Design a protein around this nucleic acid. Structure first.
Ligand code: ZN
Ligand code: ZN
Ligand code: ZN
Ligand code: ZN
Lengths: 89, 85
DNA sequence: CACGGTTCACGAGGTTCA
DNA sequence: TGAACCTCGTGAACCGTG
């Protein structure tokens, strides 16, 4: 269906919210990288499939608000223990 | 395509507008200095690739008249925090 | 299939130096 | 001023396990 962050074509659930592939990734990177973003405008930017790269603060706050969750992102160790298991197959 | 300010060949989007490399820089430099310009002639020079730099006031105007947003310029703070790594 | 991650080409922000 | 260059954030493709 539709991405709950930017409106774009969703591709399924990601981190617990219906989203597109861009926002799936923006959300994982942003949380892992612990980025802190700051809106250049008013803090209530209207996110769309085309302007979403313009306000990260608003995009990120939106992800969290529609329900996306960091706890679903793997930790480095979980990834490692996981690379080890695919590389043991 | 073509630069929305001078007609030069644009290099991609810049501050949210299709623009050449020079107008890109001119915009960012002006805004980072708040630089206010005045125009030596009337107040509507026709900006071209050639003259382009003879009227700062009219150019910066046209820049804004086509979308370029000073908000997309990195803040002294962000330009810094980031300037570390 | 669903949904975690990884790969890699590409856009757009800033910087250098003539 | 602006050509040329350095960076890294993006997202389309794609891999792998549950
Ligand atoms: Zn989205
Ligand atoms: Zn915003
Ligand atoms: Zn131009
Ligand atoms: Zn003028």
């Amino acid at each position: 269906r539709i991405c709950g962050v930017c409106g774009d074509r969703a591709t399924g659930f990601h981190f617990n919210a219906m989203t597109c592939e861009g926002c799936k990734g923006f959300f994982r990177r942003s949380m892992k990288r612990k980025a802190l973003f700051t809106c250049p405008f008013n803090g209530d930017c209207r996110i769309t499939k085309d302007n979403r790269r313009h306000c990260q603060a608003c995009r990120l706050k939106r992800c969290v608000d529609i329900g996306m969750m960091k706890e679903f992102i793997l930790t480095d160790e979980e990834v490692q223990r996981k690379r080890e298991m695919i590389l043991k197959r």
